[PDB]
Structure formats: structure tokens, C-alpha cells
Symmetry: D2
Subunit: 335 residues, 4 copies
């Protein structure tokens, strides 16, 4: 059954992203595993590499939102067996440095340039070689491959940030801008049982937020909202104007989470941040264990990743759409 050749989309600084019908199907070494891709997602991050000069390496199959079934396992591999359904952990940490093993494999220096679909081969192919089974998460039986894949980033990232902020049933948080992880952030936040107030200019966003379970929805925060009264602020747009709002409404000892691509630099009022001991925390993707938590929240139905499916050979057709106007959520491709 297992072929010796396969098709996939390999990225190259020259020809860009093109289809390859003569790609090899690597046989796993002792300690490695071969994953048969079932669902692979697409998002703006891929656009950065293909058009915004974001260099994550060269000559590698793209697709960082993987979900599939183990096709073959090398000897010594006892934690996984053929048939096991798992989702890939993007950062793909080395698992040996102090960062990995330190519970933060998402900021691994050695894995830099070796992330799934972003430096190292990804899911835009039929069979992916997993050099380090450590960066995988078992997919619950009630969770489909399309959903799982749609959680590897659209849910994992916001989840990581939410947990980093130590949100609880007593948390009073503010979210700036829905859509683009903002939506899934609403669900995740509410999963911790926290009160959620949302701010967004776009019309749809608010209606969507209100639908997702947002306790508060505004196009502009009223005056009845006392400044410095929110325990946590997540800025999904991350622009000076929006960052200023966070610092204004974040309560003393509170936290500001700039999780947007707004501007390259952002300034903060030192006097205020110092006197009220405000804290700015950086957040990137998610950790391996975080993915296990996310898949559990999805399995429990606490987070509903909304996505549509299509065959992988339609990727080019969808990459163009995302470049112009995009849609509302994500689309996973079936190899």
C-alpha cells in the first residue's frame, strides 16, 4: 500500500510554491515515524513566507497545520503505533535544550528554521516524515482530522496566550478585535469561565463575538467602563492606538498580551507601567502539552473550530483567494 513516491507542494525561494508529483516517501529511521496526512490547514502565516519575504528556510513542503494517521514507525518507537491518529506541534522543538524539557518547547533555539511546513517539510503532501515523535498530540476519537488540523494553530495559539495570562473564573478580560484567532479566543477564554468583553470596529466581528459567548460587545468602550479595571487585555490587532487602550484599561498588576501583527514596534508609558506594575507578555504559537489541552477542549465541545474541506490539489486555488479577501475561519485540505 504505502507508495514510494507522492505529490506535494514544495516551497523554494526561486519558483516559489509548486506541485511535485515525484516526491519520495522516506522510510523512518529508528526513533522516527511516517505520518499519512489526512488534513492540512492554511492561514496568513504561509502567505508571509510565499510573498512577504519571511524566511523560515528553503526547499521544503509547506503546511504547518498537520493532522493524520501514523503509517509506519521505526524500531525503538514504542509510544506510537500504526493507526494512531495524531496532530503535529508546529514549533517542532529539538526536545533536548533547556527550553524544551523546560516546558517551553515553542521557543526552542535549535528548532529554529525546522518548524513543520516552515523550515522543515510539512503537511502539503501525502506522507510526512516525523523526525521527532515527541512533537505530536493524540487526536481524540470524536475529533475529526479536519477539526484537529484546524486546532493546531487557530486554537493552539490563542489557548497558549490565554493560559499564559492565567485566566480563571474570576478573570475580567478585554479582547481587541475578533476574527483571525479572535473568535476561537472567545470560546477558549469562556472555557476558563472568565468574563469576556470585546472591542472591534468591524460590524460582523461584534455580531460573531456576541454569538461566540462574549459577555460584552462594543464598537467603542463606554465611559461607564472605569479605566484600569480589566485583569487581562489581549490585543489581536496590536497597533499603538489599540495598545494604548490596553494600558489604559488594564488594572494594576494586570497583563497586556500583544498578540497581533499590527506594527513592528510599540511604545508603552513607563511611568504608568512601573507605578501600576503592568506586565507585557510575549506569546508564540503553543507548546506540545498545550496541544493536548486544546484537543481535549475540542473533544469536549468547549471550542468549535469552524472549517471547510477541499482536496490538496486545490491549494493554489485557495492561496490566491486568501491573498485578496480571504474568508471567515480556515480551510483544510485532504491529501
Amino acid at each position: 500500500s504505502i507508495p514510494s513516491s507522492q505529490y506535494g507542494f514544495v516551497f523554494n525561494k526561486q519558483s516559489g510554491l509548486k506541485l511535485r508529483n515525484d516526491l519520495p516517501v522516506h522510510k523512518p529511521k529508528a526513533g522516527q515515524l511516517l505520518l499519512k496526512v489526512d488534513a492540512v490547514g492554511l492561514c496568513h502565516s504561509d502567505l508571509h513566507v510565499i510573498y512577504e519575504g519571511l524566511d523560515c528556510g528553503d526547499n521544503y513542503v509547506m503546511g504547518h497545520e498537520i493532522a493524520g494517521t501514523v503509517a509506519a514507525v521505526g524500531d525503538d518507537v514504542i509510544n506510537y503505533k500504526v493507526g494512531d491518529r495524531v496532530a503535529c506541534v508546529g514549533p517542532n522543538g529539538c526536545g533536548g535544550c533547556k527550553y524544551c524539557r523546560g516546558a517551553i518547547d515553542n521557543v526552542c533555539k535549535n528548532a529554529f528554521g525546522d518548524w513543520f511546513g516552515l523550515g522543515y517539510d510539512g503537511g502539503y503532501q501525502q506522507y510526512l516524515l516525523v523526525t521527532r515523535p515527541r512533537n505530536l498530540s493524540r487526536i481524540p476519537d470524536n475529533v475529526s482530522a479536519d477539526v484537529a488540523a484546524a486546532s493546531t494553530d487557530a486554537v493552539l495559539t490563542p489557548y497558549h496566550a490565554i493560559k499564559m495570562a492565567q485566566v480563571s473564573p474570576t478573570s475580567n478580560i478585554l479582547l481587541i478585535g475578533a476574527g483571525g484567532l479572535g473568535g476561537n479566543a472567545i470560546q477558549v477564554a469562556k472555557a476558563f469561565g472568565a468574563k469576556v468583553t470585546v472591542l472591534d470596529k468591524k460590524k460582523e466581528a461584534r455580531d460573531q463575538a456576541k454569538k461566540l459567548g462574549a459577555d460584552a460587545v462594543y464598537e467603542t468602550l463606554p465611559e461607564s467602563i472605569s479605566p484600569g479595571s480589566f485583569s487581562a487585555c489581549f490585543d489581536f490587532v496590536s497597533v499603538q492606538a489599540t495598545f494604548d487602550v490596553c494600558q489604559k484599561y488594564v488594572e494594576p498588576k494586570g497583563v497586556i498580551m500583544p498578540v497581533g501583527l499590527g506594527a513592528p514596534n510599540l511604545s508603552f508609558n513607563l511611568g504608568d507601567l512601573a507605578l501600576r506594575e503592568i506586565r507585557i507578555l510575549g506569546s508564540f504559537w503553543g507548546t506540545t502539552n498545550d496541544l493536548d489541552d486544546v484537543l481535549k477542549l475540542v473533544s469536549e465541545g468547549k471550542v468549535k473550530p469552524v472549517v471547510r474541506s477541499a482536496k490538496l490539489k486545490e491549494l493554489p486555488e485557495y492561496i490566491e483567494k486568501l491573498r485578496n479577501n480571504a474568508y471567515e475561519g480556515r480551510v483544510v485540505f485532504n491529501p
Copy 2:
């Protein structure tokens, strides 16, 4: 216990002026009167006097206070006359979630009502303490001069170090620490300390204070993103960029200086390497107890100079001109 007293009152107009007819209030129920023995001075005062740092108006300055309880009011059994105590600058209310949440230093109700910074301070003879909870017993082997200095010079950096969770395995960077008990405190936690300061004088001082490595410029070998924590005591865009540059992934940046009113950080870098910027303000009441205990045990030895309170005007000018180094306390 006279009926009147002298002291220095600050006004956004008249500025800091000597007042020879200030009233001496008697402690009410739950209150206490403090006989100021030593009151310190630092740059924080200059920012309020000349650099427009509104903390209130028409209040006696001096936020570094050390004194002796001259009188107590009924319903006060915690303290008794003769007791030597130091004031907890923040002067929290004690009745909010912050104060009862172990962080009375960020008390909202007390904002702008700090000792010598909104509320009456130590630049006088007698200070009425409306909230004695914001006091710390001064160890017998700790003089008033040292205690007064420790209320800020030691308390602030201590609170920042503990907040950063520094340990004996921490590899930290201090910028402009020589210009100062921060180094001793850090070493008290057993952390490896590297000091970056341009002035040779400050460097020698740091080396003397136990610094493990002092530099005017970080040499090669000290790769970027290698420090677990970076404390900026100058807090200027140039110095902050150094911290973000040399702080390791998931490391912390503590902008503990009175530099620029605003600072910018690279969003991409901070997010990618999960760098965290933590604001730190003065210290809590519990921190002041810890600090005095550390000073008493000699873990931290503040260098203090003394003089009469009526000489304050002179040292103010000398300080703003950078005429002297080290801390100087005053005795009323």
C-alpha cells in the same frame, strides 16, 4: 512634643519651601505620631520638584523615613512609644483587594497619597501616621540613617528582584546599577551578576559591591539572548534595546529607571521569544520587613552619609548638578 514644627512643603507654584509654623497633630483613634530621626533624598524628589511629576500638592516631602514613635492613639496596641520604625512608602489603605492581596504597593485608594509624595513625608520633625499598618520595626542593630535609606534604595530593587524570581542559578544583567544596593541584593539571592555602566567610577564600585562581571560594552562571548533577566536602571530607549537584545527567550526585562516617559519594544521579537516586560514599583510592607532583616544580617550594606535637615536645600542643588554620589540622609 511641641505644638508647632518646621518642615519643607512642596507646591506646584512656590516649590519646596521651609515652613517654620507647621502644626503637630496628636494621634486619634488608631493613629500614631512619628518622631522623624532620619529622612533620605533621591532623584525621585527632583522629578517632583523640577520635572513636573504631579503626586499631589501642599504636602511635606521626604519618602524615605525612619523614626521613633513619639505618641500613639487609643486602640493601638501594635506599636508603643519608643518603638523604632520605618515607613512603607506606598502607604496602602489596607482595605482593598490589592492591599489584602499581598500587593499593597499598587493600592488604588492610596495612589497619589504616598509618604512624602502626595501625603506628608519625613522632611519635618513629626509625622502623623494615619495608617500604622504601613510601618516596619527597625532592628536594634540598624541605625536610623541606614533604615531610612533602605526604605527605597534597598526596598525597590529588592521587590524587583523577587518579582523576577531571581535565584542562585540566574544569569542577570544590570544597566547603570553603579550610578546602588541592587547589586548586593541580587548577590544576596546568589545570582550571577553582570553590570553594564559607562562611568569607570561606577564600574569599580560594582566590582567592589560583588559584581561578577563589569563592562562598559558587552564583549563578544556574551551572546545575545543569554541573560535570564535584565534590569535597566537608566531606562532609555538605547538601554532598553540592549535588554531586549541580550535577554534570553522567555526572559524578563525590568525597566526600573526614571528615564524616558515612553519606551518602545520590538513586537516581533518580544512575541517570538516570549520576552516579558514587568513593571516594578517600590515595595510592599512585607518586603520592607524582609529588607530590614537582610540589612540587619549584613546581607546588604547601604552606604549612607548624613547631615542636618535644614541643609536639605543645599544638597538638593548639589544633587541636581550631580555634585555628589551615594545616598545622603537628613536628621531633623
Copy 3:
């Protein structure tokens, strides 16, 4: 503004007796007089009356208080006549390192001075509050009865669940759910954690499941993998139930012996060390906790179920509780 009142006072000699000549203390500076609107009852009271539990002597009982500020002595700035508040059991001094360290529930100076357990409580018409810092404003949408019922039934388990750092990804085990933390399940459910209940009484199991429990058992089936729970709350705290916790708690997990069981409990040293298990003691709750608790109730996260009756009927209910489970009954002075 009566100068006299009635109430139930406890005494190691004559137990809990009704008094109709009790005085109505007038608040001094910093003090405050509270008019009791509702006061709860729980087994904790039985231990002090029928089981030599010494929390002091000669004092009005009732430690689940909820009332309205009737009078405030001078200097009182935070509260004033009309304010609806609930009492914080521990009644910390607010001056020690523990109190101003965010743990006023373990105040040493307050030992034996807890509301209704050392110091006068709520089983009266007017309670004198020596330290008004130990009060929590009652939200507008929360009745006096519900609030009173939250001063212990919800507060205690909340504090423990919060201490265990339970999250929506937690897999906890609760031993005892028949009044023994009936609200614990709801509290845990509020944090989004999965809750498995173990109780020998069918009544408790039906109740547990109705309360939100994801799984209920009279005896954990062998099919349940040992050391698979992140946290275990023992509300009965007997050697047998503790051994269940240590066996099913996962490595680096926590055991919360929050029951009034045996005076002593033993753990297997080799196991605790090897799998790095941790046993955390938990007591009542802090002032900040009560604020969070009352906020959770106000938001609907926790819905305490309580029955009310006149304070005069206290003795009648104390017997009921000594013979069954239906406890969780507020009284109105």
C-alpha cells in the same frame, strides 16, 4: 436600635442555650454593628457542640453570616449604614505578615476569634464586628440567604480548588458529595474541570450527577487507571478515603484532605516521594476569596440551594442535621 436582643450562646458547660437578655453592643471607633439577616448551619457547628471541638468558650455561634450594617463607629471609612455584607469566617487581624500576605485565613492572632467559632457569631439579631476588614459586600442580585450560604459552603471548596490550581483541563476526583461540598462540584465545574465523584450513598450520587458531575461511583471500578487524577479532594478524610486519593492521584498531583475525619492520617512515604505527590492543607477561605465567591454567585456560575427558617427554630434543625443530611439551611433572626 434595640438595647437588648436574643441569641444562642455556646458554653462548654451548658452547651448551646437560648438567651433573651443578650446585650446590643455599640460600635466604637473602627468598629461596626451588623444586623443579621441570614445565618447558616453546618456540621462544623455539631463538632463544637457535640464533639468537644474547642474553638474557645462563651460566645454566640453561627459562622455563616450575612447582614446589613446597622451602625458604624467613627473612623469607619469603607462601610456605612445600609451596606449589605457577609462575614469572613477567619476574621484575621490584618496586621501580621500572613494577613497582609494574602492569607488572612491562617492568622495566628485570630486563632479562637473566628465569627461564631471563638468570637460572637450570627445566631443573634445584632453582631458586633471588631474588624470590618473581614467583610465582603453582597452584590445587589444576591439575597442575604444565598450570601450567608456562600460564606462556607462555597468559600471553603473554592479556596481549596483555587489552591490546587484546578483548570478546565483538570481531571479531579471528589470523595463525598452529600452536603460534604455539595457546592464543591459546582465550583469545580465553574473552573471547567472534569469531576468524578465517589460516595457510598445513592442519594449523594444522584445529587452529584445532578450537580454537574461527569462521572459518579460508589466504588471506583478497576477499569479506572491508578494515578490518573491531577487532584483529589477528600471531604470525608478517613484513612480509607485518603488511601484512595494517594492511589489514584497522578505523579506530581495533589491530595486535598479537606474533611473533618480522623485526627491523624498516614501516607505511604515511598510512593509520595517517588511520584512526587503533594498534600496541601486548606482552611476556610480568605477575604479576597469571599469577594470572588460572591461575584461568581452574582454571575450565575454557582447556584447555592438553601432553605430558610426563623432563628428560633435553630435547635429543631440542629437535631435534623444530627440524624440526616438535610444542613444548608439559613436562619433569619
Copy 4:
């Protein structure tokens, strides 16, 4: 290099035996071959050899390894031939939530596969390290002997002390400064805590004073107020000593039962709950802990006393240790 080597293999039926025909494994990929420079010995080995402690069967013993990378398999880039590294006992799998959660010392999959305790150890010339993640680089100023002597004697107490969150403002009580309790004083000192030691042995007390202990007692004096210690580390862990901890630990304080005194221990429930005392279990140490340990040793904040000897002398040292004879930490060079 050699096509064969010698080493001491343990078998439930034959016991610990010298083997001159041991094979030298070739690292597949992601693995490496470690030439053992120094391997320590402690009482833990005796429990396996004579006290029936079952950690597995048919494996080279020696769980305190220090060596040099002799060869690396393909795909191995973090390490290269010549690197000096120490082994992390637990040898976690590195794939479960425990290992990925910063606590590889309690890995379930790895239980029964610890270096020298289930899996092959250091009592040989060349050790095949299956999971390189469980290694800690040895600072250039730290000898192999000292490093090996830190893999347990220092790592274990360090992990426990770190877990209790000791700080420059801590006031701790240490019961039993006989074995690992010795380096425990140096480690606690490194964190800046005040240390009060309680030990019945005279020599132990004298050692405590030398190691910088602030207070050393044969019996705690009446001047010591009950519930005044922020943390209590009990190295003997007997009911009598545990009661001491529960009596002298302050509210919210922590009791660390790091001994083998008894199979069970009881605590006063009322006391524990009312004052919120916490009992924390501690086992060996993590991989990152070893990094910290080697740094503390490298800086000279912890100085483990060690004497070396040829590996083929192990049998004699075992018997002597088995009788308390030499007593002093001893490492062997293959």
C-alpha cells in the same frame, strides 16, 4: 574504539558480576556512545544488590555517570565527539506530558529504564545513551570525578530545596546531615537561607558547623518557638522526626520528607488543614536541575568531597560500604 569492553552487570540470580566480554554498541541515530570517565557509588545500589529493590534485571549498574562522548549517531547535532557530559538518572522518555512538562524525573514510560537502575549504567567503559536529552554538559573547570559525584549527592537535595522555594529570607530546619543532608546545607546556603541543623551524631554536627550551618543542635532548645520555620527537610524521615517538622513548621510552611525512615508516616490532620501546612514529595532531580547543579559546583558554591579508585575495585568498596566501612563518597574510573 574497542570491539569489546568490561563492566559489572547485575542479575537477580547471579548478583553483580564482572564481565570481560561485554559488547560495545554502535549508536543507531539520535543516540551516542559515552566513554565513562567517572561513575559513583551510593547506598541506592545496595538496595538493588542486597535488599531486593527491583528496578529490572540484566543491566550494567552505576547511576552516577560522568563521561566523554566517544561517538555519535546520525542526526545527532547537539553533541559531538569530545563533549564532556553527565547522565541524568531518571532518563525520561522525553515524549510524555511529564517529560514535556518539565518533570522528566517522574516519567512513567521511563520507570525501569533508569541509567544503571533498569537500563545499562556507568560501571563499564562505554555506555550507549539512547536519549541524549538526558545529559548535562560538564563545565570545563569541573573534573569528571566531581561531576559524577554531583549526579545524585547534589542533584537530589538541590531538587528538593528548589521545590520548597527557599530564598534569602527563608528560615529552614534540616534534620539529619549524614548523607545527602551534607550537600543540602551548602545548597541551601547558596539560596541565602538561614539553616538550623538537627542531628544526633556528633560528627554530623561538627560537619554541619564547618559547612556553614547557622545553628547546630543535638536536640532543639526551648528557645526555639514552635511553628517558626518556613521549611523543614527531614532526611531521616521517621515518625518522631516528622512530628518535629509538623511542630516547628510555620503556617503555610512546607515539610520535605526526603528520607527512608519508614514505609509510612502520619500527620496531624487538624494541624495541617488549620495552618495549611504542605507536604511535598521529592525524587532525584530533573535534567535542567543537573544543569543548575553543575553550575553551582562550577562556581564553587557546592563542593562535594570525593575520592577515586579503579573501577575493578568496585567489589571491595561495595562490601565496605555495605558495612559502613569507608563511608566516604567514592567514584570509579573505567
